[PDB]
Design an enzyme around this catalytic site. Sequence first.
Site, PDB file in Angstrom:
ATOM      1  CB  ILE A 101      -2.051  -4.736  -1.976  1.00 43.76           C
ATOM      2  CG1 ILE A 101      -1.715  -6.224  -1.952  1.00 43.76           C
ATOM      3  CG2 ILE A 101      -3.135  -4.508  -2.976  1.00 43.76           C
ATOM      4  CD1 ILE A 101      -2.768  -7.061  -1.266  1.00 43.76           C
ATOM      5  N   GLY A 102      -1.419  -1.654  -1.707  1.00 40.81           N
ATOM      6  CA  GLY A 102      -1.794  -0.253  -1.937  1.00 40.81           C
ATOM      7  C   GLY A 102      -2.481   0.422  -0.751  1.00 40.81           C
ATOM      8  CD  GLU A 103      -1.709   3.704   1.696  1.00 35.63           C
ATOM      9  OE1 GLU A 103      -0.551   3.193   1.848  1.00 35.63           O
ATOM     10  OE2 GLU A 103      -2.505   3.940   2.641  1.00 35.63           O
ATOM     11  CG  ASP A 141     -16.860   3.573  -3.617  1.00 34.40           C
ATOM     12  OD1 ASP A 141     -15.748   3.386  -3.005  1.00 34.40           O
ATOM     13  OD2 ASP A 141     -16.930   4.449  -4.510  1.00 34.40           O
ATOM     14  CB  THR A 192      -1.709   0.439   4.771  1.00 31.08           C
ATOM     15  OG1 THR A 192      -1.528   1.820   5.075  1.00 31.08           O
ATOM     16  CG2 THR A 192      -0.552   0.121   3.822  1.00 31.08           C
ATOM     17  CB  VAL A 193      -4.469  -3.142   1.106  1.00 38.58           C
ATOM     18  CG1 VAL A 193      -4.841  -4.582   0.774  1.00 38.58           C
ATOM     19  CG2 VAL A 193      -5.733  -2.323   1.370  1.00 38.58           C
TER      20      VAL A 193
HETATM   21  C1  LIG Z   1      -5.491  -1.130  -2.013  1.00 41.80           C
HETATM   22  C2  LIG Z   1      -5.755  -1.207  -3.502  1.00 41.80           C
HETATM   23  C3  LIG Z   1      -6.640  -2.376  -3.939  1.00 41.80           C
HETATM   24  C4  LIG Z   1      -7.886  -1.783  -4.604  1.00 41.80           C
HETATM   25  O1  LIG Z   1      -8.617  -2.855  -5.148  1.00 41.80           O
HETATM   26  N1  LIG Z   1      -7.189  -3.143  -2.831  1.00 41.80           N
HETATM   27  C5  LIG Z   1      -7.185  -4.495  -2.701  1.00 41.80           C
HETATM   28  N2  LIG Z   1      -6.619  -5.323  -3.598  1.00 41.80           N
HETATM   29  C6  LIG Z   1      -6.618  -6.654  -3.449  1.00 41.80           C
HETATM   30  N3  LIG Z   1      -6.093  -7.479  -4.366  1.00 41.80           N
HETATM   31  C7  LIG Z   1      -5.766  -7.027  -5.716  1.00 41.80           C
HETATM   32  C8  LIG Z   1      -4.331  -6.587  -5.892  1.00 41.80           C
HETATM   33  C9  LIG Z   1      -3.285  -7.378  -5.405  1.00 41.80           C
HETATM   34  C10 LIG Z   1      -1.957  -6.984  -5.593  1.00 41.80           C
HETATM   35  C11 LIG Z   1      -1.670  -5.795  -6.268  1.00 41.80           C
HETATM   36  C12 LIG Z   1      -2.713  -5.006  -6.761  1.00 41.80           C
HETATM   37  C13 LIG Z   1      -4.043  -5.409  -6.589  1.00 41.80           C
HETATM   38  C14 LIG Z   1      -7.203  -7.223  -2.330  1.00 41.80           C
HETATM   39  N4  LIG Z   1      -7.347  -8.540  -1.886  1.00 41.80           N
HETATM   40  C15 LIG Z   1      -8.085  -8.382  -0.728  1.00 41.80           C
HETATM   41  N5  LIG Z   1      -8.298  -7.063  -0.462  1.00 41.80           N
HETATM   42  C16 LIG Z   1      -8.947  -6.283   0.604  1.00 41.80           C
HETATM   43  C17 LIG Z   1     -10.441  -6.600   0.542  1.00 41.80           C
HETATM   44  C18 LIG Z   1      -8.190  -6.456   1.894  1.00 41.80           C
HETATM   45  C19 LIG Z   1      -7.769  -6.375  -1.447  1.00 41.80           C
HETATM   46  N6  LIG Z   1      -7.759  -5.040  -1.602  1.00 41.80           N
END
Ligand SMILES: CC[C@H](CO)Nc1nc(NCc2ccccc2)c2ncn(C(C)C)c2n1
Lengths: 149, 292
Positions: free
Chosen positions: B10-12, B126, B17-18
């Site tokens: 999903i991203g950083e 934040d 890392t997510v």
């Molecule tokens: C890492 C970049 C993005 C910033 O919102 N983070 C994100 N994004 C999430 N979902 C939105 C997303 C999904 C796929 C691509 C881009 C954004 C998300 N779902 C649960 N979580 C955390 C609390 C673990 C999520 N975190």
Amino acid sequence: QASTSELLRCLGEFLCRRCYRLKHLSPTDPVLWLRSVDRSLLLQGWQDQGFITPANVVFLYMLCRDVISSEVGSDHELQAVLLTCLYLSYSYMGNEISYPLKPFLVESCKEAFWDRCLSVINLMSSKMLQINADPHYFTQVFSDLKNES
Amino acid sequence: MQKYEKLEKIGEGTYGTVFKAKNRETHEIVALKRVRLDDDDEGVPSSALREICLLKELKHKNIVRLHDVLHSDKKLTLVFEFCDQDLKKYFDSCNGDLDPEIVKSFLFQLLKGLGFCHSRNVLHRDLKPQNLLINRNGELKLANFGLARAFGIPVRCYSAEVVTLWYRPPDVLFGAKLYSTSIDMWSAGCIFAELANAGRPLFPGNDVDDQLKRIFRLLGTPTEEQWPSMTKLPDYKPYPMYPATTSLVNVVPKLNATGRDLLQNLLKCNPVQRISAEEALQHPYFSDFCPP
Ligand SMILES: CC[C@H](CO)Nc1nc(NCc2ccccc2)c2ncn(C(C)C)c2n1
């Protein structure tokens, strides 16, 4: 007895009483271990000011009184546990976003440190918040710490 | 982990890392935040432990839900509910054009989540669109508590280096060392304005001075009578007096008079004057609405 040095001594005296197996532990030993960490973080540029304040010592005591077993078998073990509690106090109450692991780690096994961190959070997360949200609870803990001398 | 199959990145985040993942036993889709514990980036576990501590105590439909924490290797994996997108990406998908009713819904849900944090003695610190997660349901969740903290215990000061610049209140820009729940109320006002326009930041300053000027140029410069402690703040300096007569109409075109009144209540420069989350939810802007 609202001075930082006095409360740290109260915490050191509490730890000596709690950890009855540790026959050669000085109540100044914990004081020395805590001050050393705070001094090293200042000198190495991790923080602008010292973390060890009266309220943060009360916070640390609140963790120690529930986390630290009477059955701790060595001075080294006590130090490892106490420094775990201190690192969680830095992470929860400190003004910087991150603190490094190095000054807090005295064990060769890193994974035991992180496991102890999670175990403490599982036990204490509620009380860590409560001591902020409930001023009477804070006052009660501060009173108990004083009465440890 | 070994209980979870990684589907994509999903991203950083602020400290890890997510990933989007699937629970191999229940088949549920979750989000994993992975955190390396054998650092050369030395302080990262600290913010993660803080997040874990707070989110364990913050269980609300409009706050991202932490389900589990696993420790398996040289990593900490935090298991969260999965959300489809953040508000920043949502702005790109809809060409920054929200229907007024979705504007209301998103603010309402943000204020509920923020009200819950504030009533449990937690500051988020934040608040910005990327920290707001949106579901296809249309549910909004406050996420990313790595800069958050509990408050209430006697403290010398808090950090003034909090909140991304564009969302930071004037008192913190003037270097205030003590602030309350008001800090997050300003940021919510900033988000409200993005929602109610074209999804662009209201105050995109290049530095602290520019940020303060942008705010005062629109809202007017506070007087000593409106804000008596303003000149006593640690990084105070004299600003030009811009009039308080500038119209908000074209700044938030999706908003009516009632909407503009709530915005102005969130965007008070004097933190003591800022509306609380609890009072904002009682504002006539939300009187005829869905959930309750
Ligand atoms: C890492 C970049 C993005 C910033 O919102 N983070 C994100 N994004 C999430 N979902 C939105 C997303 C999904 C796929 C691509 C881009 C954004 C998300 N779902 C649960 N979580 C955390 C609390 C673990 C999520 N975190």
